[PDB]
Design an enzyme around this catalytic site. Structure first.
Site: not given
Ligand SMILES: Nc1ncnc2c1ncn2[C@@H]1O[C@H](CSSCc2ccccc2)[C@@H](O)[C@H]1O
Ligand SMILES: Nc1ncnc2c1ncn2[C@@H]1O[C@H](CSSCc2ccccc2)[C@@H](O)[C@H]1O
Lengths: 273, 274
Positions: A42, A44, A69, A77, A143, A145, A181
């Site tokens: 939810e 994403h 990394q 979805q 996000g 987060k 998460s």
């Molecule tokens: N509960 C949540 N609420 C809001 N955003 C969330 C979240 N859980 C995850 N996200 C948001 O999911 C996104 C994508 S996964 S890591 C970003 C990335 C992707 C590819 C290469 C390098 C970096 C993040 O921006 C995270 O903050």
């Protein structure tokens, strides 16, 4: 390279997604990138709707697990959230030459989440730079987060003059307040009922802040201390750009903690005074 | 509004933003944007960069002038004379409003050769090339082969970061004796200016000795250099054309560097082995 509108179009080759993105941006459509690592929850989807409510938007969601990394489900979805483009590159196509030219973050990358894992942000920023070059979006969504990742991405965009707007999207929470998460899938109703301590400590700290920075921290530290089997990695008060100690004005409170081997992060807005 | 643009004349901006607003807009109208990165104090060398950029159907040429820390109307008058329509001349502060922060980290190639003396030079070089690319977003970007290792690393930047631009490498402009033009040549006394010819002499000898193979081409070049007084060689190296290991046959590249008094000179040439 074919784009069927109103439908979900899946590209693997950087070249295809680039060509289309480009085609589209000529048609008056505004490209929005949502970079992901798969396993969409939810949380994403917030990122996707935010992008979606941009007038003219064509949404690109990238699904790439970077080795430095649930493909189907994620796609379902997406088809369902109305997303037109999914970019799913191979590792070979993203690293034909291995780690050669990379991005080196600023000193912020060695702190907090970068303290134990000091090349992680280099890994992250490098792929985000490649994604934004492949897709050339108008805006790119992240996000709150992963707030340190957010700030670092804004530095990236500023330091390199990238022509893209970075939109941070506020965290999405379960009904008790726990930050959504993937990692929360792990967690016995033991650990998972203790997990609520993170956000409770944060929201308390945020209320207690009228009494100052120092009360805000003690408040939060008091809440984690009263929680069975939450081992804190850090609890830290910063300015919004992740410098010092927000003068005494307004800033960010950040938390990282283990439940079993399951590491959780959370953060919140805070005003002092 | 887009800022003020007057076709057929030299328009100057130093606002990153202004040259980015104008670049974008010309592009939308069917001009193809060409960028020429320079560090000022232009001469023929720079000028053949400029002419190759001009010779593209529908080009608008952009010459940046900026001096790169971590690596005047004289100049612009040359640009006017060359029919260049955009110069870009930002201040150190405009390029770096938060100091050195996020930077590009090069592949191992940045350690070798010219990166021996200056181990962080190319990080500086690539970080600003990236920036200009992002500010101007040209179709093509232009560099002299004179600085061949530079040019190979810019190509690696472009491939690794998936940049949108064709990198065009421009043949070295030489004096009549074959000396590669460089602002540093003004400094050599007449004895040095004279011995200075040995660099190109060895590279072209090498290139013609080369039908006999690799050791021949290197020995030829070394002999020419041993016949010069006051020329201390930093390295003399043959490599494949992307600067990997000395190749066995077919295309390759030969690079040299040498100190005359306090002046450090460089030069390189294509090689066909056997
Ligand atoms: N509960 C949540 N609420 C809001 N955003 C969330 C979240 N859980 C995850 N996200 C948001 O999911 C996104 C994508 S996964 S890591 C970003 C990335 C992707 C590819 C290469 C390098 C970096 C993040 O921006 C995270 O903050
Ligand atoms: N004799 C010569 N012949 C051909 N090109 C020459 C030259 N002398 C110099 N050049 C070519 O002149 C161009 C301008 S020199 S500044 C290069 C740069 C600019 C901004 C950021 C980083 C690096 C270079 O591409 C060089 O190779």
């Amino acid at each position: 390279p074919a784009f069927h509108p109103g439908e979900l179009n899946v590209y693997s080759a950087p070249g295809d997604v680039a060509d289309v993105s480009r085609a589209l941006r000529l048609t008056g459509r505004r490209v929005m990138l949502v970079p992901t690592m798969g396993a969409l929850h939810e949380g994403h989807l917030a990122l996707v709707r935010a992008a979606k409510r941009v007038p003219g938007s064509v949404v690109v969601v990238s699904i790439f697990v970077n080795p430095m990394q649930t493909p189907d489900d994620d796609l379902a979805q997406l088809r369902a959230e109305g997303v037109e483009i999914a970019f799913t590159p191979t590792t070979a196509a993203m690293y034909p030459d291995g780690l050669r030219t990379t991005v080196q973050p600023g000193p912020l990358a060695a702190e907090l989440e970068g303290g134990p894992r000091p090349t992680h942000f280099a890994g992250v920023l490098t792929v985000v730079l490649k994604l934004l070059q492949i897709v050339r979006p108008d805006r790119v969504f992240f996000g709150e987060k992963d707030y340190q990742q957010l700030v670092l991405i804004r530095q990236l965009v500023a330091d390199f003059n990238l022509d893209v707007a970075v939109v941070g999207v506020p965290t999405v929470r379960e009904a008790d307040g726990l930050a959504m998460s993937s990692r929360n899938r792990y967690l016995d109703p033991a650990q998972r009922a203790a997990a609520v301590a993170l956000s409770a400590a944060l929201t308390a700290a945020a209320h207690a802040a009228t009494a100052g920075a120092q009360a805000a921290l003690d408040a939060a530290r008091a809440v984690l201390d009263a929680a069975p089997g939450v081992a804190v990695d850090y609890l830290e008060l910063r300015d919004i750009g992740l410098g010092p100690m927000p003068l005494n004005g307004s800033g960010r409170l950040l938390v990282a903690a283990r439940l079993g081997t399951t590491r959780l992060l959370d953060n919140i807005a805070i005003e002092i005074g």
